[PDB]
Design a binder for these strands. Structure first.
Ligand SMILES: [Mg+2]
Length: 643
RNA sequence: AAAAAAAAAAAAA
């Protein structure tokens, strides 16, 4: 320090301790300087020397100095490092090695060495999971990491998968546990083995959760039995398998394969409702009126079925539309499909008239070759076969929601509040100012939410809807009943997918207690926290591997003038993001690609509009056409240009 | 200043 002190020392301590401080997030740039962003309307310049103390995304406290030109930020204290556990490719030779983190915005190679104990000889090119050990703002000399796990070598074709799963600390392998023995839970299994139950799925599906059987009754009434796989017949609450299943809370589905929640021999074999195999199920028998309402006499019962057809969606859809080679190869199972189509028809009607029918965009399926190469990425629209299963499943889950509510009062419920009550006034004002009246109090009720939803659906474009997306809440998992706004239902609880959700297994045991007239333990409202956490991580992992594959699929289209139809999905000041409609990739279009004169060009995020010379040329919702300009593999980003 | 590690909802995987 500067050390000549009398009580000058005390003066300088006081003076320096009274300078202003701001907390904020570091934002690095292409150049040597950066900024400390405090709020969306305030930020301070960080001099190049000062940027050497921080990393992009670090949350810090800086002391603020007035300078000749502007106010300046000098980082003082690290509130939160942007980077702790991370993944990245390692560089460097033998005992002098660095890792550059996978995060697109962090380009700097961070020195590192292996942890004590690790057997892998780390070397240039292989991917690793490292831990940040050392920060300049912590008093340390410089940035330093230790390599904590070896993911794989750079040339591993399945790199996108292993890296992503490691990044999210998700399991890379099917459970090591072993199916043990089918339990006698005191249930009486109705033998439904003679009935023409069918399953309808993707051709590649190996773990069929649901099976359906339909029967005509007098009075234009239809009967539907929903038969669901039951792994709980093999896995007792509190078993080894149970504990393991609780932790992975879902099967993780990624392009080209999945990491199953339960041991693969029960999931893809012993529980799967395979064609012409005798299987235990937990069944729901319901009666549907002419208008599609689920009548009062719902029966949940344990049973045993034998599926008479592993049907595939597209074939069933082809047939109900009559195209294609495929035909139900038996009159009996043809009568099943068309009865099931009637049920769909009735229920689509019921849901339109008393709830909400969300208009549904296409799924996208990665078609992979042997070596993990993506051959194609295809739109997979929801047609009638999909709709047939969906209506049955929703109905079944509605039944479970009633029964659990009316018999236990608790369960694993899927709740969705629609709009956050703290946002209701802002929502109302925003729509009203675009010329669509809404009432902030109504809109927080089911009917209000539904009323608005229909009016929004009646709009030419999805523009206004997009403006209010920022106000919409996510489905949450709750331990007790609650509205599901997005589905326009009082209460909703899923039990139809136990092979691939610990939640549905929890509901299976609950429903079984009910069937048996037995006493049941309320689930602890902490297991929902594990579940929601995994659901989030799974969703991210799926999207992330997707993005990586979208890049490598589109790599050889860069610079070519092949055209893609694209929906503009989001606008930042940096430009636009578009979704390529017939593969579903996300591409970024940089602002200059839109005009080239920066002065006349505004890309408003709040307005979700691009304006050249004061006239809007693009808004968040338009379909435009694009070429692939560039795809940079280092950061797996697709840059598109308009046409 | 060519942006960025978040999904509004459902179904099937
Ligand atoms: Mg299924």
């Amino acid at each position: 320090m500067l050390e000549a002190d009398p009580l000058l020392a005390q003066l300088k301590q006081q003076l320096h301790s009274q300078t202003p401080r701001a907390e904020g997030v570091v934002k690095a740039t292409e150049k040597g300087f950066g900024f400390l962003e405090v709020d969306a309307q305030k930020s301070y310049f960080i001099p190049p020397p000062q940027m050497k103390k921080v990393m992009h995304g670090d949350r810090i406290i800086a002391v603020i100095h007035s300078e000749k030109e502007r106010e300046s930020a000098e980082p003082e204290e690290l509130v939160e490092p942007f980077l702790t556990r991370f993944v990245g490719k390692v560089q460097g030779k033998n005992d002098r090695l660095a890792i550059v983190p996978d995060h697109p915005l962090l380009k700097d190679a961070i020195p590192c060495r292996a942890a004590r104990g690790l057997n892998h000889e780390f070397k240039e090119g292989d991917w690793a999971v490292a831990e940040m050990r050392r920060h300049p703002l912590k008093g340390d000399r410089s940035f330093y990491a230790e390599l904590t796990q070896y993911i794989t070598f750079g040339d591993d074709h399945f790199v996108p998968w292993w890296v992503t799963l490691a990044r999210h600390n998700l399991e890379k392998e099917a459970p090591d546990g072993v199916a043990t023995e089918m339990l006698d839970e005191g249930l009486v299994r109705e033998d439904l083995t003679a009935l023409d139950f069918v399953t309808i799925d993707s051709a590649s599906t190996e773990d069929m959760n649901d099976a359906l059987f339909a029967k005509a009754l007098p009075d234009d009434k239809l009967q539907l039995i929903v038969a669901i796989a039951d792994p709980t017949a093999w896995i007792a609450e509190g078993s080894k398998l149970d504990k393991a299943a609780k932790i992975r809370a879902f099967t993780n589905y990624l392009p080209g394969f999945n990491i199953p929640m339960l041991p693969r021999e029960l999931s893809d074999d012993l529980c799967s409702l395979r064609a012409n195999e005798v299987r235990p199920v937990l069944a729901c028998r319901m009666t549907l009126s002419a208008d599609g309402t689920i009548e009062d006499n719902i029966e949940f019962f344990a049973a045993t079925i034998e599926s008479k057809a592993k049907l595939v969606y597209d074939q069933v859809s082809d047939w109900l539309e009559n195209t294609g080679d495929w035909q139900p190869e038996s009159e009996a199972i043809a009568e099943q499909v068309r009865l099931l189509a009637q049920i769909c028809q009735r229920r689509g009607e019921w849901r339109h008239n008393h709830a909400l029918v969300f208009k549904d965009r296409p799924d996208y399926r990665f078609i992979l070759g042997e070596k993990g190469e993506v051959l194609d990425i295809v739109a997979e629209p929801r047609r009638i076969a999909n709709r047939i299963v969906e209506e049955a499943m929703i109905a079944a889950n509605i039944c479970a929601a009633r029964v659990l509510r009316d018999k236990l009062g608790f369960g694993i419920y899927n709740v969705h509040m629609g709009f956050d009550p703290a946002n209701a006034d802002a929502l109302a004002a925003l729509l009203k100012t675009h010329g669509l009246h809404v009432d902030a109090e109504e809109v927080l009720t089911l009917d209000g939410f539904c009323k608005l939803r229909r009016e929004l659906d009646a709009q030419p474009t999805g523009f206004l809807d997009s403006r209010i997306r920022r106000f919409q809440s996510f489905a949450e998992i709750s331990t007790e009943p609650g509205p599901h706004f997005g589905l326009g239902l009082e209460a909703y609880a899923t039990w139809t997918s136990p092979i691939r959700k610990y939640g549905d297994m929890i509901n299976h045991r609950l429903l079984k207690a009910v069937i048996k007239g037995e006493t049941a333990t309320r689930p602890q409202d902490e297991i929902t926290v594990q579940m929601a956490e995994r659901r989030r991580l799974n969703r991210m992992a799926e999207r992330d591997v997707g993005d990586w594959l979208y890049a490598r699929f589109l790599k050889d289209k860069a610079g070519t003038d092949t055209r893609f139809a694209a929906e503009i999905v989001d606008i930042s000041r940096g430009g636009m993001r578009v979704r390529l409609v017939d593969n579903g990739a996300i591409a970024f279009i940089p602002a200059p690609f839109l005009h080239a004169v920066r002065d006349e060009l505004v890309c408003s995020q709040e307005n979700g509009t691009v304006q050249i010379k004061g006239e809007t040329v693009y808004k968040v919702t338009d379909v435009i056409d694009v070429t692939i300009a560039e795809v940079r593999m280092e950061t797996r980003s697709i840059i598109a240009r308009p046409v």
